[PDB]
Design a protein around this nucleic acid. Structure first.
Lengths: 142, 258, 124, 187
RNA sequence: UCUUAAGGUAGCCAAAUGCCUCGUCAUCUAAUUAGUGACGCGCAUGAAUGGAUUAACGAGAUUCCCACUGUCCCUAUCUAC
RNA sequence: UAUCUGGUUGAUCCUGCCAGUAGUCAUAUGCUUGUCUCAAAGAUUAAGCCAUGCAUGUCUAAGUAUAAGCAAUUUAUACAGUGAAACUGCGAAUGGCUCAUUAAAUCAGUUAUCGUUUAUUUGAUAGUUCCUUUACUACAUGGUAUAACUGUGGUAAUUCUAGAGCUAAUACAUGCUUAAAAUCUCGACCCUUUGGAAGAGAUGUAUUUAUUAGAUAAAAAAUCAAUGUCUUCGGACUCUUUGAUGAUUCAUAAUAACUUUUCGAAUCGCAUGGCCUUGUGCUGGCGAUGGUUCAUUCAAAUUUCUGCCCUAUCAACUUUCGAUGGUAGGAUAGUGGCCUACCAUGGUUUCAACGGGUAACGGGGAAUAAGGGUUCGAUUCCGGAGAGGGAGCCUGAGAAACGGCUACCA
RNA sequence: GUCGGAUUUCCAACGGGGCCUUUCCUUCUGGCUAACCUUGAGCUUGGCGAACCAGGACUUUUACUUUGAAAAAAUUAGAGUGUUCAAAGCAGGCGUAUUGCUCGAAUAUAUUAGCAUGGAAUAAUAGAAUAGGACG
RNA sequence: ACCCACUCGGCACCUUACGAGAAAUCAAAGUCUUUGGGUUCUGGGGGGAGUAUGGUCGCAAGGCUGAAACUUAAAGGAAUUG
RNA sequence: GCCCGUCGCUAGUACCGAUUGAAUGGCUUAGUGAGGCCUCAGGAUCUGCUUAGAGAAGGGGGCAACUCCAUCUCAGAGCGGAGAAUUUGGACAAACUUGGUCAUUUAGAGGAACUAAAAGUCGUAACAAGGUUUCCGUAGGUGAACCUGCGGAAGGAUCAUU
């Protein structure tokens, strides 16, 4: 949260190591990746101090499957949010529509800062937790 | 499920096998083999309702155990052996080889040819990667793998297998203007001289394929299988040449040359 | 388990049973075409309604459609093969307006009687 | 009969799911490892498709890698001193993944004296030239040097004793060691 | 019709008020002159001689149940005076 | 086949129902026992109970033999015919039945595994071990009983067994026989220095590290910490390796070590024609058993997006410590509050959560069709659950298995 | 001009594609040396890019149109077929009566959500306000 | 203040209405089988019955919500004949 | 003429109802709690191990007091080792009592509600100004329909006054 090392454990990207014996430029080593599908890794993810092993830019998760867009509705939960997808359902008898909203929780990397009302696109990844199955990939609400 | 499925019933079997709904309630289930469950033709049904060589399951199994037939150069005495697309099965009695090809309407057509076409066959590369000890290899649709391929072979390519050695005599790549064979979907068994492709980054590429009648259609990349360059084929085309003619023209041509 | 074997009905009981006009007309046609029962006119009307509905849902579609052309040609070929319609009329008006009497005056039961090798429809 | 499915778990809306299916062999669970120190008793347990799992109990000696020096030797674990998950684990002195332990490291000391041959604390020509070539790189850190002098290196055992039966690990370097010693000193 | 000043209204009842009476029906029990509910031609209930109801309260008066036990089957033993 | 008619009044026009009418792969019942055709069939109540008998066993040229079985033996001084029983291997997790439970739970369409599956798979094996070792030591290649059998006994007794003795592996702890190259850890030569050729030896396949190759946007000149093949130490210094998708720490190869050790025919049939350095020596071809490996396959597992009947006579629901999320661990074939340790009050909800009912298994689909529709789907195929109610487990690749077991309960 | 139908000179209604009207269909650059400044003796071998593809930004949200995967197979719509018709089923054939092949086993949004390119009318939605504004 | 004209806004009606309605009748009850400007609420034959085991408000009287069993072939509306 | 309500007769239906009663009551901060599984244990039985301490000349031996070598047999104990029988801590968890609505009512004494009632008794409440116009809201009284007091309505017996 506020600091990288708040937890009693040590936060680091697995299987990447910087030698303390040697003294070269860019002493710390961090690893990033391209999320794919034409999504750009932001500078915050590129040169941030966070770890977020469950993020799709520097963590050990993969983005493949469905891509959704929705407006976030809550942020009070840590390192993840819930977006709202306000689709509309068609029924054939009366030949019209009705508004149905589905609330799906999504993990957000510290690379993005999200507030209520933000429009966010998310990508499907492996089951991250009990409810969370998607990962935030881009925010377009400044 | 509690386990794997070991039975298959009629009307629950793939359409291209052409099993009548009467005269039994079960279908010949193909066990583990070189081809998919749906996109393959078992040897028993192939002998039964395509050549009418045998008329009984007992006679078919006896034929199989007496080693009078063989597949791809191997006897393969399996009573429900699955042989799918591009499968070569030669018959020593009169030495006639059958290639299991796809007709225009979408069923397992059989092409009877001679020893040269028995020897040489075509295969579609599924993936190319590196094995243990730094050994590169490929995967084909029938599992006929060749070790140590030439570095030009990439995904979605076709190769020629001599059925005797492990060397790829001919290889044909993937690009515009090539004779193709769509194996899947509603266009089962059509040759349409691939024109272009929409990649759609993320998978599920689409290919524009146009028959000699200028009948242009689209298909998934997972279904098209290049079989040769424009003009000459690598293997003999089946009857009908994979045209899929319009319904009125086909019906009046049947009426005329019935 | 045994694979299912399909069966179908072939006749339709009319919506109202007692018409002094419909019952009387169907009695005339049955008597004058040698029909032992009423279910036979019921089933012949069932086939006539089937073919008329096929013609109607064929005609409701726009002209030159290949499905329309194929279905109409197949229906015309079958109707020419059975022979109830003259083989030099392709306006489809006669096949849509085909009546039960016209359909029945072509089947072999009337043919044998009119050719005279039976001298009676009941005898035939 | 340790279940692993979410069917017994209440839904995200707070609803209690009804009993749909009897729990299966697939989503079974098994008892933890609780690996102790000394007199190794590795137990083999058959899993799905074979694949014998090695439940480590009473592990004695483990393989530890020095990331800076690029070496890994088999040394005896003195005991666990810090565990980020549970302090009860430290109290019972059990060995789990990512656990901070202390090891004899006398393989490591001997390998250091064979590699660099530099006097610490305070003979052929080939050995002389090789030590000269490998010199100018014995400046690891004061904390690591003092820990070596004390004779018990700080390591993180990061293998899975309950899956493989070995408490393989790596020696604490740089920021990792500094952070963990800070936690050890902090109350 | 006799008849008074009026002829017991609302309520309640074998009620601490019912003689007959251990009233009749149901329930509580194996069995109940007990208890509760219900019925009222109520010997002789009944409206500030207050009627009916009522949460809480009661060293008030009855019934049942659980627990518990020498009240009892069926008594025995110990201590102090 | 886009239809109506009878019934309120003395009479009339009306909203309105009660009827009449026609169907049902919708039943039951009463009257008809004449004939080609496939044949629905104990589902509604009682997923209630079962007396009886069956429904899972298994062989080839190619695993072990001798019920004290058969006859030719004429190739066997060890046999390659038949070989019942028993051991080993495999199956029995298929199939068939029913619809009890189940309301985002199944299921349908569509996805993901870069989050995991894999008996026989299957396309083929893998010149790497003579571990007090240049000689404890067989590799013309080791050891024992558990079975049938020879007899003994136990109860009314069970697909019950105690026994004493013979015998086999795909059994066991073992075990080894087949090269050859290149790199790497140490090392008898220099009162020095751009050297190792002898030797001690290590480098196949499972688990932890950590890195290198795991690089393509884009090019011009000084520098140093030390010379690295070699023209003229002005320095030409190049050929130096580099695999797909959008993406991974991907498939990979190597580096001191960890392996307590799982391993690379101590199985069997069929052809046996070539040469002599005489051994039955060297060699001659096929077939079921295997791999700690992948070359997709039959299979399972969770999982993405949408869609389910009636109810507000159900507006709030979700916790001693799972109730949404973060870190770490454990467990799992791996994802995951799946389970534990440590924060906030987090998640759902009038767009109907939650709760209740269902005379609810979900689909393809079944009955009329102008259209839009209203009911039904227990049942011939797919998927799920169960095999008296619950639970918990061994073997097995796969079972919460019931024509497998254990324990409690109509 | 050839009934079981087709034009090479066209008064017209037209599905449509490019040209310029303050409007380059929206790009800085190359692979096959690209429909063209280029050119002995009427057959024109480098300037203005996209006919098959990549390095650099937006492919900004939603409701329609042909397609594809395919909406399991059955079952319905239903071409063809003497089960003697018909329900059905995918059967069924003889001329050189003694050496062939098959006509076939289909073109039908089959409670309807999700992916891909061109079409943007209709109804919203955000672009530059005491300029954190676009161009270099 | 009054009259004569134009209004804007709100309360009422007789032309055999071409409009609507079963008809009384209606400047809306028209622009509705040539059926669609936007929305809320209510009814599905007459009784049982505005009766609920229930739930809420009220000190009470009572208010809101609100059935079913069962019964019935009629109940009712608008004219038209004494 | 139609017609309303008590009351009496018959039958049916539903409701209330003492009886602290009887359909997975699904889970208790619950208590007992088999059985399987993982496990902290002494491994009661077993195969190959050292003949040294036992009766032994022998093969080799100046056949005069010492030996590789087992056997008819027992010793003071260490491994390749499943592990029974049992047993300590757990984690699943059958089945026995309990602050819960039901998706039947049962046995329910009793409580004159409702519809059918049969040619019932008592008076007309309404239908005409029904002889007191009718009807609604509220309140009270009386055998019964009803009556009365207050606010209104016309669905009135008045569309009407100068």
């Amino acid at each position: 949260e506020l600091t990288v090392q708040s937890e009693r454990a040590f936060q680091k990207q697995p299987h990447i190591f910087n030698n303390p014996k040697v003294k070269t430029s860019k002493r710390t080593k961090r690893w990033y990746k391209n999320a794919g599908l034409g999504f750009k890794t932001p500078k915050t993810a590129i040169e941030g101090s966070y770890i977020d092993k469950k993020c799709p830019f520097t963590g050990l998760v993969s983005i493949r499957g469905k891509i959704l867009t929705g407006t976030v509705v809550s942020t009070k939960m840590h390192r993840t949010i819930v977006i709202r997808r306000a689709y509309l359902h068609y029924i054939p008898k009366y030949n019209r529509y009705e508004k149905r909203h589905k609330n799906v929780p999504v993990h957000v990397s510290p690379a993005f800062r999200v507030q209520v009302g933000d429009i966010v696109t998310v990508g499907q990844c492996r089951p991250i937790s009990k409810t969370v199955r998607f990962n935030v990939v881009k925010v377009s609400a400044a | 499920a509690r386990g794997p499925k070991k039975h298959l019933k009629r009307l629950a079997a793939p359409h291209h096998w052409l099993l009548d709904k009467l005269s039994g309630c079960y279908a010949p289930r193909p066990s583990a083999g070189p081809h998919k469950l749906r996109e393959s033709l078992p040897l028993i049904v192939f002998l039964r309702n395509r050549l009418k060589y045998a008329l009984n399951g007992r006679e078919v199994k006896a034929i199989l155990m007496q080693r009078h037939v063989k597949v791809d150069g191997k006897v393969r005495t399996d009573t429900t052996y699955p042989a799918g697309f591009m499968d070569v099965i030669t018959l020593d009695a009169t030495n006639e080889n059958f290639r299991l090809v796809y007709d225009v309407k979408g069923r397992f057509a059989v092409h009877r040819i001679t020893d040269e076409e028995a020897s040489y066959k075509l295969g579609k590369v599924k993936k190319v990667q590196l094995g243990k000890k730094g050994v590169p290899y490929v995967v084909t649709h029938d599992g006929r793998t060749i070790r140590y391929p030439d570095p030009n072979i990439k995904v979605n390519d076709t190769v020629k297998i001599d059925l005797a050695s492990g060397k790829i005599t001919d290889f044909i790549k993937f690009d515009a203007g090539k004779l193709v064979y769509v194996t899947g979907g509603r266009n089962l068994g059509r040759i349409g001289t691939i024109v272009h492709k929409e990649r759609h980054d993320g998978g599920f590429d689409l290919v524009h394929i146009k028959d000699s009648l200028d009948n242009t259609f689209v298909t998934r990349l997972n279904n098209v299988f290049v079989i040769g360059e424009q003009g000459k084929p690598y293997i003999s085309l089946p009857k009908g040449k994979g045209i899929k003619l319009s319904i009125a023209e086909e019906r009046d041509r049947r009426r005329a040359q019935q | 388990p045994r694979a299912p074997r399909t069966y179908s009905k072939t006749y339709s009981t009319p919506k109202r049973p007692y018409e002094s006009s419909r019952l009387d007309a169907e009695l005339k046609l049955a008597g004058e075409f040698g029909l032992k029962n009423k279910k036979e006119i019921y089933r012949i009307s069932f086939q006539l309604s089937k073919i008329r509905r096929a013609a109607r849902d064929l005609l409701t579609r726009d002209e030159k459609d290949p499905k329309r052309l194929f279905e109409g040609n197949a229906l015309i070929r079958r109707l020419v093969r059975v022979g109830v319609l003259s083989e030099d009329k392709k306006k489809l008006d006669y096949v849509l307006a085909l009546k039960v009497e016209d359909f029945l005056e072509r089947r072999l039961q009337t043919q044998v009687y009119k050719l005279g090798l039976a001298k009676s429809v009941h005898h035939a | 009969g340790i279940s692993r499915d979410s069917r017994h778990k209440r839904s995200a809306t707070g609803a209690k799911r009804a009993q749909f299916r009897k729990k299966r062999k697939f989503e079974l669970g098994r008892q933890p490892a609780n690996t102790k120190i000394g007199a190794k008793r590795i137990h083999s347990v058959r899993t799905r498709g074979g694949n014998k799992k090695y439940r480590a109990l009473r592990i004695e000696t483990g393989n530890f890698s020095w990331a800076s020096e690029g070496i890994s030797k088999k040394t005896r674990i003195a005991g666990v001193v810090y565990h980020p998950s549970n302090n009860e684990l430290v109290r019972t002195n059990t060995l789990t993944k990512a656990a901070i332990v202390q090891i004899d490291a006398t393989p490591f000391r001997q390998w250091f004296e064979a590699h660099y041959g530099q006097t610490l604390g305070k003979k052929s020509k080939n050995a002389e030239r090789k030590w000269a070539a490998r010199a100018a790189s014995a400046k690891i850190e004061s904390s690591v040097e003092s820990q070596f002098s004390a004779g018990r290196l700080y390591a993180c055992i990061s293998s899975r004793p309950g899956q493989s039966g070995r408490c393989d690990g790596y020696i604490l370097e740089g920021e990792e060691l500094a952070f963990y010693l800070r936690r050890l000193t902090a109350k």
